[PDB]
Design an enzyme around this catalytic site. Structure first.
Site, PDB file in Angstrom:
ATOM      1  N   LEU A  21       0.819  -1.210   0.000  1.00 19.12           N
ATOM      2  CA  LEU A  21       0.000   0.000   0.000  1.00 19.12           C
ATOM      3  C   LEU A  21       0.857   1.266   0.000  1.00 19.12           C
ATOM      4  O   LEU A  21       1.851   1.357   0.724  1.00 19.12           O
ATOM      5  CB  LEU A  21      -0.954   0.006   1.203  1.00 19.12           C
ATOM      6  N   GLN A  22       7.125  -1.160   5.538  1.00 23.53           N
ATOM      7  CA  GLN A  22       6.142  -1.315   4.469  1.00 23.53           C
ATOM      8  C   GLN A  22       4.740  -1.585   5.015  1.00 23.53           C
ATOM      9  O   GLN A  22       4.581  -2.294   6.012  1.00 23.53           O
ATOM     10  CB  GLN A  22       6.562  -2.429   3.496  1.00 23.53           C
ATOM     11  N   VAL A  23       3.736  -1.004   4.362  1.00 21.64           N
ATOM     12  CA  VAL A  23       2.339  -1.285   4.687  1.00 21.64           C
ATOM     13  C   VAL A  23       1.724  -2.127   3.570  1.00 21.64           C
ATOM     14  O   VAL A  23       1.730  -1.734   2.406  1.00 21.64           O
ATOM     15  CB  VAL A  23       1.506   0.001   4.927  1.00 21.64           C
ATOM     16  N   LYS A  43       1.635  -3.476   8.862  1.00 23.59           N
ATOM     17  CA  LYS A  43       2.918  -2.788   8.818  1.00 23.59           C
ATOM     18  C   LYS A  43       4.008  -3.724   9.329  1.00 23.59           C
ATOM     19  O   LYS A  43       3.889  -4.299  10.413  1.00 23.59           O
ATOM     20  CB  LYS A  43       2.891  -1.479   9.623  1.00 23.59           C
ATOM     21  N   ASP A 153       2.856  14.303  11.495  1.00 16.99           N
ATOM     22  CA  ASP A 153       2.682  14.254  10.040  1.00 16.99           C
ATOM     23  C   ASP A 153       1.201  14.285   9.641  1.00 16.99           C
ATOM     24  O   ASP A 153       0.737  13.476   8.833  1.00 16.99           O
ATOM     25  CB  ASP A 153       3.392  13.018   9.465  1.00 16.99           C
TER      26      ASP A 153
HETATM   27  C1  LIG Z   1      -1.024  -0.885   9.173  1.00 18.89           C
HETATM   28  C2  LIG Z   1      -0.812   0.361  10.041  1.00 18.89           C
HETATM   29  C3  LIG Z   1      -0.143   0.175  11.251  1.00 18.89           C
HETATM   30  C4  LIG Z   1       0.086   1.254  12.099  1.00 18.89           C
HETATM   31  N1  LIG Z   1      -0.348   2.548  11.735  1.00 18.89           N
HETATM   32  C5  LIG Z   1      -0.104   3.624  12.620  1.00 18.89           C
HETATM   33  C6  LIG Z   1       1.185   3.876  13.103  1.00 18.89           C
HETATM   34  C7  LIG Z   1       1.416   4.935  13.986  1.00 18.89           C
HETATM   35  C8  LIG Z   1       0.350   5.742  14.390  1.00 18.89           C
HETATM   36  C9  LIG Z   1      -0.942   5.489  13.918  1.00 18.89           C
HETATM   37  C10 LIG Z   1      -2.108   6.389  14.350  1.00 18.89           C
HETATM   38  F1  LIG Z   1      -1.820   7.601  13.889  1.00 18.89           F
HETATM   39  F2  LIG Z   1      -3.276   5.981  13.849  1.00 18.89           F
HETATM   40  F3  LIG Z   1      -2.228   6.417  15.668  1.00 18.89           F
HETATM   41  C11 LIG Z   1      -1.162   4.433  13.037  1.00 18.89           C
HETATM   42  C12 LIG Z   1      -1.031   2.734  10.501  1.00 18.89           C
HETATM   43  O1  LIG Z   1      -1.418   3.855  10.177  1.00 18.89           O
HETATM   44  C13 LIG Z   1      -1.268   1.641   9.652  1.00 18.89           C
HETATM   45  C14 LIG Z   1      -1.932   1.819   8.427  1.00 18.89           C
HETATM   46  C15 LIG Z   1      -1.303   2.504   7.382  1.00 18.89           C
HETATM   47  C16 LIG Z   1      -1.951   2.670   6.154  1.00 18.89           C
HETATM   48  C17 LIG Z   1      -3.232   2.145   5.964  1.00 18.89           C
HETATM   49  N2  LIG Z   1      -3.879   2.293   4.789  1.00 18.89           N
HETATM   50  C18 LIG Z   1      -5.118   1.784   4.619  1.00 18.89           C
HETATM   51  N3  LIG Z   1      -5.745   1.940   3.456  1.00 18.89           N
HETATM   52  N4  LIG Z   1      -5.737   1.122   5.616  1.00 18.89           N
HETATM   53  C19 LIG Z   1      -5.144   0.955   6.792  1.00 18.89           C
HETATM   54  C20 LIG Z   1      -3.862   1.463   7.004  1.00 18.89           C
HETATM   55  C21 LIG Z   1      -3.216   1.302   8.229  1.00 18.89           C
END
Ligand SMILES: Cc1ccn(-c2cccc(C(F)(F)F)c2)c(=O)c1-c1ccc2nc(N)ncc2c1
Length: 284
Positions: A21, A22-23, A43, A153
């Site tokens: 999407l 590493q993710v 992730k 961010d």
């Molecule tokens: C998989 C994952 C794991 C951890 N985090 C994350 C990391 C740090 C902070 C946060 C926050 F900001 F939500 F608290 C979230 C994430 O944002 C994500 C993440 C990233 C991109 C994504 N994109 C889609 N379309 N769906 C879910 C996602 C999750």
């Protein structure tokens, strides 16, 4: 911070990894009590990560656990942390992707409000939508700020669209989102997140336009920003929403609204907009 394995740990062989999407997008079997198979986001560290790189993602996982659940923050579902394979942090999957890209695709599908016949504006974006996305992100940020968290961010690219117009804060040129004190002093606070929220508002009410259109991001850009130059009102804004952006862009961090104040203010503008809409709908 603690890691409670009994609650969070998910077996690696219950995942099927998919497209990055590493993710990465993935299918997860039995992650819920609500369904057997579910689409998720994972992730993980790339091949050849150091001990310190492992700690970074682990600390991020623990922080997501400590933070807890909010509708407007991407929901953690589980983790693979025990030996046998790579560290994996598993959240819900938002299939519609980031808010910037989505708003950009709706530019021919915008009306400020709907009247009869409403089918002429099927799946169209309205002012209620845009204020509603703003309100939702404000609430998620108030949830994060209350837990002493700083996002660092905050941008439309880090806002995800879920089903039924629910948006979620996630964490996937950055200078265009940074507060003056962050640029010049490297200071990160909740108040600098409020600045970024203001730039995010501009993004929403321009339908996914790039901030500071056509401006070169050099030392002159930073000079002018520190000295009080601001972006002009975007194309889809209301007067109150632009004033809110200017409030978020105050030179003094302590003079910016709190996320709590933004939640209340945006909630009132959402209600005023809805009352206006019901009058438009009634008389036509
Ligand atoms: C998989 C994952 C794991 C951890 N985090 C994350 C990391 C740090 C902070 C946060 C926050 F900001 F939500 F608290 C979230 C994430 O944002 C994500 C993440 C990233 C991109 C994504 N994109 C889609 N379309 N769906 C879910 C996602 C999750």
């Amino acid at each position: 911070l603690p890691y409670d394995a009994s609650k969070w740990e998910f077996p690696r062989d219950r995942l099927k990894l998919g497209k990055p999407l590493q993710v990465i997008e993935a299918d997860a079997f039995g992650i819920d009590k609500t369904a057997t198979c579910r689409t998720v986001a994972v992730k993980m560290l790339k091949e050849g990560a150091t001990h310190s790189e492992h700690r970074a993602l682990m600390s991020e996982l623990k922080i997501l656990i400590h933070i807890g659940h909010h509708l407007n923050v991407v929901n953690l579902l589980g983790a693979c942390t025990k030996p046998g394979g790579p560290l994996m942090v598993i959240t819900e999957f938002c299939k519609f992707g980031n808010l910037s890209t989505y708003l950009r695709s709706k530019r021919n599908e915008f009306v400020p409000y709907k009247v009869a016949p409403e089918d002429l504006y099927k799946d169209f974006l309205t002012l209620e939508h845009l204020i509603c996305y703003s309100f939702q992100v404000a609430k998620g940020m108030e949830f994060l700020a209350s837990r002493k968290c700083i996002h660092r961010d905050l941008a439309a690219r880090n806002i995800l669209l879920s089903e039924k117009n629910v948006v979620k804060i996630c964490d996937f040129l950055p200078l265009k989102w940074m507060a003056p004190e962050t640029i010049f002093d490297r200071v990160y606070t909740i108040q600098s997140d409020v600045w970024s929220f203001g730039v995010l508002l501009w993004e929403i009410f321009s339908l996914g336009a790039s901030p500071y259109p056509g401006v070169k991001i050099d030392e002159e850009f930073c000079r002018r920003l520190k000295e009080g130059t601001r972006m002009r009102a975007p194309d889809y804004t209301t007067p109150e929403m632009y004033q809110t952006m200017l409030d978020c862009w105050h030179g003094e961090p302590s003079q910016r609204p709190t996320f709590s104040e933004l939640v209340e203010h945006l909630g009132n503008l959402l209600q005023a907009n809805a009352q206006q809409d019901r009058h438009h709908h009634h008389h036509h």
